[PDB]
From Swiss-Prot:
The modification Phosphotyrosine is found at Y15, Y19. This is Cyclin-dependent kinase 2. The lineage of its organism: Eukaryota, Metazoa, Chordata, Craniata, Vertebrata. The gene is CDK2. ATP binds at residues 10-18, 33, 73-75, 78, 121-124, 137. The modification N-acetylmethionine is found at M1. CDD domains: STKc_CDK2_3. The modification N6-acetyllysine is found at K6. Its cofactor is Mg(2+).
Amino acid sequence: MENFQKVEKIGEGTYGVVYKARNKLTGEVVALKKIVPSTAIREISLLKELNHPNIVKLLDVIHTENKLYLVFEFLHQDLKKFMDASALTGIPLPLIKSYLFQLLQGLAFCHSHRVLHRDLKPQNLLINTEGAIKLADFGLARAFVTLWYRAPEILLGCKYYSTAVDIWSLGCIFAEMVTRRALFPGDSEIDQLFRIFRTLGTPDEVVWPGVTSMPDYKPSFPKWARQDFSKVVPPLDEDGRSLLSQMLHYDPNKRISAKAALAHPFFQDVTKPVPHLRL
């Protein structure tokens, strides 16, 4: 721990403060997250084995007197900041497509190892000058404020949700890159839920078998009609709209998997362009 020289504070993460650090020993520039229960210890130890080029590498874990430090590889910017930076002009479709493709590969990898993220959002998506995008904070939720990317089954009380929640979240982020506006900016659990309802229509037994039996489901939920999908993500092409609708399917079991999504015609012409970051 004294092996680190805090270069500066990046910001407040979900589980603590994040500092840019320099390994006084190896000189490597890393990201230090100042996060303890023995169960969370084995859980994040298992995360060290979860390596993929689209997953932010957990270099080391340092436990010392209730203090838990997670040493991560450092990336220069997050997707939230990049989106704002390219808000007026919009992120080019080839870069949007490239990013979604890479995130799906990363998700496909984690999901193949029965590891869910559970909390995908633009701030935990880190990018570099080389065109790569990675998933940050993977597995930390199972281990240990924005509802915008929350899957509906989570909002309806499902206590044993699946990998499908990450697909839903990524779909919301996908739509946000395309339109330059958050898809469902809920400011309360009920507002989030109803925002989803107003756009995708209020779910029933037809589209989502067993929805009415969900814990937080109320028969009194207003019945909104599903909106024309072409009004949701204009001007995304038919392939993208097809993929997005599949990623936003109400029934978690019918929602497209990361693996399957990678096969969608939308990616037939995927390339790896680089973003222009002003570091």
